[model samples]
Target chain A: CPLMVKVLDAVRGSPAINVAVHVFRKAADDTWEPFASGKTSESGELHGLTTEEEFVEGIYKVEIDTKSYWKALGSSPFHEHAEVVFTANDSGPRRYTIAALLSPYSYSTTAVVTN
Target chain B: CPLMVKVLDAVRGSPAINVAVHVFRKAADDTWEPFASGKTSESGELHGLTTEEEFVEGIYKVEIDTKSYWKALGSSPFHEHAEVVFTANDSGPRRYTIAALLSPYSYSTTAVVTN
Candidate 1:
């Protein structure tokens, strides 16, 4: 897998399990088209979203359903949704792992990119 | 100040100096009202955003001009801006420190709330 995500619940200090993740690739016309989607595992990881052969250079967007995740936990969230967007494979093929920490009223995202 | 922010640059593995930060409070009419704004220091920290007495119960938004930060560094970033929103002062008056890590293609935010 070329792209993966690890989500943690800051309030609980644990993995944010079952959080839904949607992946999109920007089309040439500027519209976004869905590529993959899945939910986080017990370890707060969503792996194998895309293969290296398919995830070529382009703009990619990862949308995490943060609102729903907090609501399910019985807390009102602030943002309607949380998203991370970036240009990928510009220099060459690389691996990306997004680490997200979620709170009812806050969230943080970080990425680790490697060759 | 009850609210502060610390921003780090992941790509360079250092503090993101001079990154602009804007703070807003959501009004009853659902409009966001400007409260404070400033740039990060050499340590990538923005202090005294708001006072405890003034930061009462409400929804707050902190917007970081990430695009400009990366652009100034000669790299094109993805997100138009990076923001963290949440409800505050519900249980009691507390201090909030937003820790943000930024990358050209990614970013992450975490909050340390204390009494």
Candidate 2:
């Protein structure tokens, strides 16, 4: 199955549209090897991240360059970018969404997975 | 019990050293009420956050202005600031330390509880 991802802002429950996003797969070297990367769409979505031919069953992480996004808008966020870690397997179609959340004093993240 | 807090850069396990930190408590209105604020010491710590008289028990948050700290050093952090949400009560000395962590794309945090 292929991978699809989405980014959203928890503050307004709005899409974090038009931001850079990267995906990495943990390798045998215990290091993160970049697999696929792109930017969120106008609706805050990324589809076809990787096809089954390039997909693997292991630990995977998604990262969004949040600071630069905020910077493009002439602002700053509470923390830097946003990231999510999850497990991917061949059991079924794996669907995930990583939402970004933060404030001046604190920060947080959330993920929803559908199989 | 009085509150004492510490900040550290999780990567090097070193004191965050000279970053601004703010402490807040969740109020009856579900909004954060700033209680006290300060900067990390040379040892990356904040002492005497609040005495028992000004303390309450539902929830509390600590935020460190990570971006500004890095900016002071002429650098940029992945996120804006680091924030930690915790629960504080009259149970013990109410000791806690909020550590800041991040990278170009992903970020994390850790905490230690003491009495």
Candidate 3:
């Protein structure tokens, strides 16, 4: 199956601060390896990372650069960063989408793929 | 102070489906005007709507096209749509950030503007 994931910081404050995104794949030995890294534009968006044909099916983790984002606004964040863990199943012939909502204090992510 | 806002749908399922966003301002008499309208890309993101100098500070509502988003995925949505209400204060000299998290079954919004 082909899977594409988009991560976004949907906030209306301090748009000037860019949120950095890092994706890691959990290996079979329970370690993580870097998969991708990107930063949100002035608009707070990072998009278009699709699983390649050789994409493995397993757990993935996303890390948000919350500290720098908050500091850019001259404020301190209650939480230094936000992380999301998800599983991707590429065993089928369909497409999957994932999104994340981020704020200075909190965030949430959801998976919308279901057979 | 200048203010900026971003909206995004954080979900992983149908990356092809696009979520449409509409922003309306509530009038004193309880009416709404078309403030802005945009659609999320296949990446499920829409960003960079800032309040110009003429931006009025008041109550505003956002509407999402849930039905079409779900239909594009070959599924039915439990809810036909989603809405978010918030207040923008241009009365101060500080930047404000607002963000929304959206999913097939749930969503949340927060305003980070505080004096």
The candidate that achieves the highest TM-score relative to the unseen native structure: 1
> By DockQ thresholds, what CAPRI class is model 1?
acceptable
- What residue pairs clash in candidate 2, if any at all? A78-B80, A78-B81, A79-B79, A79-B80, A80-B78, A80-B79, A80-B80, A105-B63, A106-B83
Model 1 off-target regions past 4 Å?
A1-115
Better of 1 and 3 by DockQ: 1
Quote the positional error of residue B48 for candidate 2 in Å. Answer: 1.5
Q: Please state the error at residue A54 of candidate 3 in Å.
A: 3.6
Q: How close is candidate 3 to the true structure, as a TM-score?
A: 0.53
lDDT of 3 at A17: 38
lDDT order of candidates, top first: 1, 2, 3
Per-residue lDDT of candidate 1, residues B1-115 (tens digit): 6889999988999999999998888898887799899999999999877787888888777788898899998986767567766777777787888888887756777677777
Instruction: TM-score each candidate.
Output: 0.61, 0.47, 0.53
Tens digit of per-residue lDDT, candidate 3, span A1-115: 3444444544543232355778788988899999876766654456555446645688888777654454445355376566778776666534554556565666666555634
Expressed as tens digits, the lDDT of each residue in A15-37 for candidate 2 is: 87777888888888778889898
Model 2 per-residue lDDT tens digits across residues B74-96: 65444445555555553544545
Clashing pairs in 1: A108-B109, A109-B107, A109-B108, A109-B109
